[PDB]
Design an enzyme around this catalytic site. Sequence first.
Site, PDB file in Angstrom:
ATOM      1  N   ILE A   1      34.271  12.497   3.106  1.00 43.35           N
ATOM      2  CA  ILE A   1      35.400  12.986   3.918  1.00 43.35           C
ATOM      3  C   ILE A   1      36.314  12.011   3.419  1.00 43.35           C
ATOM      4  CG2 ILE A   1      36.238  12.840   6.223  1.00 43.35           C
ATOM      5  CD1 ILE A   1      32.294  12.538   5.929  1.00 43.35           C
ATOM      6  N   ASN A   2      37.853  12.552   3.589  1.00 46.59           N
ATOM      7  CA  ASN A   2      38.989  11.797   2.764  1.00 46.59           C
ATOM      8  C   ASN A   2      40.009  11.667   4.053  1.00 46.59           C
ATOM      9  OD1 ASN A   2      38.667  11.996  -0.327  1.00 46.59           O
ATOM     10  ND2 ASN A   2      38.132  14.378   0.595  1.00 46.59           N
TER      11      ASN A   2
ATOM     12  N   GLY B   1      51.475   8.291   5.712  1.00 45.65           N
ATOM     13  CA  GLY B   1      51.749   9.282   6.521  1.00 45.65           C
ATOM     14  C   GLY B   1      50.805   9.660   7.670  1.00 45.65           C
TER      15      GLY B   1
ATOM     16  N   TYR C   1      26.759   2.831  10.168  1.00 46.48           N
ATOM     17  CA  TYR C   1      26.874   1.499   9.679  1.00 46.48           C
ATOM     18  C   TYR C   1      27.657   1.627   8.468  1.00 46.48           C
ATOM     19  CZ  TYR C   1      25.268  -2.298  12.686  1.00 46.48           C
ATOM     20  OH  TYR C   1      25.058  -3.431  13.427  1.00 46.48           O
TER      21      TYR C   1
ATOM     22  N   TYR D   1      28.954  -8.108  12.646  1.00 48.87           N
ATOM     23  CA  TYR D   1      30.152  -8.892  12.886  1.00 48.87           C
ATOM     24  C   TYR D   1      30.367 -10.590  12.640  1.00 48.87           C
ATOM     25  CZ  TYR D   1      32.166  -4.316  14.404  1.00 48.87           C
ATOM     26  OH  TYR D   1      32.621  -3.336  14.443  1.00 48.87           O
TER      27      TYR D   1
ATOM     28  N   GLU E   1      46.473  -2.122   4.335  1.00 44.18           N
ATOM     29  CA  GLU E   1      46.219  -3.218   3.645  1.00 44.18           C
ATOM     30  C   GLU E   1      45.109  -3.825   3.470  1.00 44.18           C
ATOM     31  OE1 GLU E   1      48.237  -5.884   6.857  1.00 44.18           O
ATOM     32  OE2 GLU E   1      50.166  -5.430   6.002  1.00 44.18           O
TER      33      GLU E   1
ATOM     34  N   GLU F   1      33.101   2.332  14.493  1.00 48.47           N
ATOM     35  CA  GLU F   1      33.270   2.299  15.889  1.00 48.47           C
ATOM     36  C   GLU F   1      34.043   3.364  16.654  1.00 48.47           C
ATOM     37  OE1 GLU F   1      31.272   0.313  17.130  1.00 48.47           O
ATOM     38  OE2 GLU F   1      31.258  -1.774  16.208  1.00 48.47           O
TER      39      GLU F   1
HETATM   40  N1  ADE Z   1      28.700  -2.755   8.518  1.00 50.66           N
HETATM   41  C1  ADE Z   1      28.866  -2.252   9.923  1.00 50.66           C
HETATM   42  N2  ADE Z   1      28.684  -1.090  10.087  1.00 50.66           N
HETATM   43  C2  ADE Z   1      28.787  -0.393  11.357  1.00 50.66           C
HETATM   44  N3  ADE Z   1      28.678  -1.265  12.353  1.00 50.66           N
HETATM   45  C3  ADE Z   1      28.776  -2.209  12.390  1.00 50.66           C
HETATM   46  N4  ADE Z   1      28.859  -3.322  13.143  1.00 50.66           N
HETATM   47  C4  ADE Z   1      28.703  -4.544  12.647  1.00 50.66           C
HETATM   48  N5  ADE Z   1      28.880  -4.606  11.248  1.00 50.66           N
HETATM   49  C5  ADE Z   1      28.904  -3.106  10.936  1.00 50.66           C
END
Ligand code: ADE
Lengths: 258, 258
Positions: free
Chosen positions: B4-5, B10, B75, B118, B141, B172
Amino acid sequence: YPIINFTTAGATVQSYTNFIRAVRGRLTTGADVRHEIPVLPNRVGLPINQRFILVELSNHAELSVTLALDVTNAYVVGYRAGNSAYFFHPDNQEDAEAITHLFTDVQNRYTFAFGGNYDRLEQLAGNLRENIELGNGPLEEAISALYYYSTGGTQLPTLARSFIICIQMISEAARFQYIEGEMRTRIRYNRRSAPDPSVITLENSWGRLSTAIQESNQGAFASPIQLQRRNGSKFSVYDVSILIPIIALMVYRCAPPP
Amino acid sequence: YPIINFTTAGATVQSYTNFIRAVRGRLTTGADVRHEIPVLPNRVGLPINQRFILVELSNHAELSVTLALDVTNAYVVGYRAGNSAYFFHPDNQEDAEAITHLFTDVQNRYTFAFGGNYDRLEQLAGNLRENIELGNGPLEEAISALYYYSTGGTQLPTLARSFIICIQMISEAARFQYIEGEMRTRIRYNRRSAPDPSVITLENSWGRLSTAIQESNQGAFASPIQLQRRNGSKFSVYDVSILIPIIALMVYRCAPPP
Ligand SMILES: Nc1ncnc2[nH]cnc12
Ligand SMILES: Nc1ncnc2[nH]cnc12
């Protein structure tokens, strides 16, 4: 008051479906829908001019009878057959006064000494709901019995049995899509059969289900409700989700929370 | 694997919406929908040929980077920038083996000593999610930082921060319509802002919410889940009903009951 007509003569599942659909449409305003389920008008503040709907029933014998349903609970409060009108015993003054607005044109108005709840009616009929057959045939007969009561032709136990039939095929079918479905089947195959435990338990639980849904936490019931399946096995309800396709209307129990 | 691109150059809320919509479409098969919410494929029995999807990102600087997402949890497992490929530390052998099937054509394959959760990433970045701005500018960035890592141009803390940005705007946003909506707003008004408590709590609760919904009683949670509103006030969830418009995908936790 709005009048909806239905005839048992040549009734089909479609003529019966249209009928029940028309009744629900008169009963509810559309101003209150809780979890996809319409709620009936609140009795407080409702003007008498919008308190009742009439259901005129006719049969193959060409006899006609008109039933009065109270809009706040879909209850049959009384009926009219030609010259006379009969009302179940009111259970409060507000109600005693409201019915004075129905069938004002009849020459003979009578108010029974008994009310219209199933317990009383089953005692008078000398039979329980589980033993009284439902279907188009029983309804056709009920219309005549109700009609002949005004001529001294119907016995008290037959009158009671007739009401039991009428109340389940009109009021209960309007309240629950499930019960309306059970009726459509009887009509489709021309079957005449007493209601199974699934039907009776729903009838018994309408007020509680209406309350549990309206006081639920985002649809989740605080305490589960036990219902019965057709085979008689108990079945617990924890959420309004499984009832959306079962219950068609709810009685107003509380205002909706923000 | 499907690619998927998306380009930050823009970008509009519509180009971003289409993108997220395309990702969700690749992630889910449509064979498992629980209470109107799609469930991701179960890791057990899933063939490697259907284990990943690639997301090729480009920016106004014409730099391109390709991220690999694992289909069972959405993920980001690693990425590719020209000559080299980088993978987060696998947390089991099944996963260590699966990633051997990605970017097989790169000359330099590296596997970080740290994983992609995280906690680890925030430690390396030297900043928490609540302090890292999200938006199209930060994403533009991040793509360059990720790209320059392969040339010795990006610092470890900037690499970590970049992943944090990428993971929230892609993974997310695909998981929660709520978070995707927060991103659309940033893009619409060209705002660059760190995520509020509502966003962070949802991110933190995805696994639990997926489990609570899948193990619920007709939609009713056994125990409520505490989330936070944008203003930081706690808010309890008792039913799957209020989450239907919030969560877009769920991780597979159990088979659906009869
Ligand atoms: N690398 C990752 N991919 C997807 N959801 C995540 N939540 C924390 N790290 C993640
Ligand atoms: N008369 C009645 N009308 C409606 N529902 C009822 N349930 C029991 N009696 C009833």
